[PDB]
Design a protein around this motif. Structure first.
Motif, short mmCIF file in Angstrom:
data_model
loop_
_atom_site.label_atom_id
_atom_site.label_comp_id
_atom_site.label_asym_id
_atom_site.label_seq_id
_atom_site.Cartn_x
_atom_site.Cartn_y
_atom_site.Cartn_z
N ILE A 1 81.81 46.59 60.71
CA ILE A 1 82.36 45.48 61.48
C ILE A 1 81.83 45.48 62.90
CG2 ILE A 1 84.61 44.82 62.72
CD1 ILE A 1 85.92 45.57 59.84
N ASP B 1 80.84 42.46 65.48
CA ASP B 1 82.15 41.89 65.91
C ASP B 1 82.18 41.10 67.25
OD1 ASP B 1 82.11 44.23 67.42
OD2 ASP B 1 83.92 45.05 66.51
N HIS C 1 80.92 44.78 55.19
CA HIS C 1 82.32 44.67 55.66
C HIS C 1 82.61 43.59 56.72
CE1 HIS C 1 83.74 48.01 53.26
NE2 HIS C 1 82.54 48.53 53.49
N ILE C 2 81.57 42.91 57.21
CA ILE C 2 81.72 41.73 58.06
C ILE C 2 80.63 40.72 57.69
CG2 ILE C 2 80.48 43.00 59.92
CD1 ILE C 2 82.20 41.13 61.88
N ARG C 3 80.99 39.44 57.67
CA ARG C 3 80.03 38.37 57.40
C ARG C 3 80.37 37.32 58.41
NH1 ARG C 3 79.47 33.42 55.21
NH2 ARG C 3 77.78 32.86 53.76
N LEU C 4 79.34 36.84 59.14
CA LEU C 4 79.49 35.67 60.04
C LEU C 4 78.64 34.48 59.57
CD1 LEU C 4 79.08 37.60 63.41
CD2 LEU C 4 81.29 36.95 62.53
N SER C 5 79.14 33.27 59.88
CA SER C 5 78.41 32.02 59.63
C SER C 5 78.57 31.07 60.83
CB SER C 5 78.99 31.35 58.39
OG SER C 5 77.98 31.13 57.43
#
Ligand SMILES: CCCCCCCCCCCC(=O)O
Ligand SMILES: CCCCCCCCCCCC(=O)O
Ligand SMILES: [Cl-]
Ligand SMILES: [Cl-]
Lengths: 155, 155
Positions: free
Chosen positions: B28, B32, B139-143
């Motif tokens: 993350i 983050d 464990h983290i995905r951004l769009s």
């Protein structure tokens, strides 16, 4: 947004311990930092005899992991609850098997979580979570490992 | 980790403008905050005649959106490049059609991006991205939306 709700929800059967295994939101900033507004970790559900749902959670407040208790008041719809806010916000239960997983979303802008009963990556529940999310405009998704699940505020 | 690479990659054909439409990472904290280590926005690819790949990117540094240029040096494998670091890191191209989308990952701990040629949510490329990710411990995905895509550091 937000048209997956659980039919025949028995709110008494969601009582007890939960782990926020995964979280997702429509705005990155709703979940990006530990202190972000919707980064909240569910600890326990307490449905009341009236059928209100009391929620115990952790939120990282100012430099620390605060414990918070919130009441979600019931509505005409069994799967939809209301939280009093500034103005205020609906909680919808999308899906649960009571015994392993529960999916829910809060809206009003939107955040959803995959709750599980144990500190374990549940492949099934995560599949359900992603399926329910493909319908939604999400821009950040978080997931936590079993070690973080046993830690306060998943630290 | 990380066993999807592009066969028959022609590195000259990835030259030009790209947009980091989506990002994902195994930790993350790699993505983050705006200043997180792997939150980098690709601006342009410049393959050199040797077949090294020059990368122009933006990174949010100290209170501002700095422009950075990095060289990824070629290897024996056409789809794998090397960045000199503290120690250092492989860039793999997983998939590209040259004209619409490019998927790549950086490893060493892991971050992947879905690059697109235009400021547009590409449903196809995002499908490919998620498919390539299901293989990986993310464990983290951004769009990012089209408005943020036209902004420096997607702000
Ligand atoms: C099944 C219900 C699941 C519990 C929903 C959690 C709602 C938390 C709302 C966060 C608001 C706050 O903590 O300030
Ligand atoms: C096809 C290659 C895609 C470009 C890969 C980007 C690598 C960026 C590495 C980030 C390191 C840094 O900016 O400090
Ligand atoms: Cl944002
Ligand atoms: Cl973390």
């Amino acid at each position: 947004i937000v048209t997956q709700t659980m039919k025949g929800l028995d709110i008494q059967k969601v009582a007890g311990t939960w782990y926020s295994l995964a979280m997702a939101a429509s705005d990155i900033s709703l979940l990006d930092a530990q202190s972000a507004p919707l980064r909240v970790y569910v600890e326990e559900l307490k449905p009341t005899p009236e059928g209100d749902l009391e929620i115990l959670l952790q939120k990282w407040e100012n430099g620390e992991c605060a414990q918070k208790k919130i009441i979600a008041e019931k509505t005409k719809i069994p799967a939809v609850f209301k939280i009093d806010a500034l103005n205020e916000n609906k909680v919808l239960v999308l899906d649960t098997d009571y015994k392993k997983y529960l999916l829910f979303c809060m809206e009003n802008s939107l955040a959803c979580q995959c709750l599980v009963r144990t500190p374990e990556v549940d492949d099934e529940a995560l599949e359900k979570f992603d399926k329910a999310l493909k319908a939604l405009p999400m821009h950040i998704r978080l997931s936590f490992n079993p070690t973080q699940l046993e830690e306060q505020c998943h630290i």
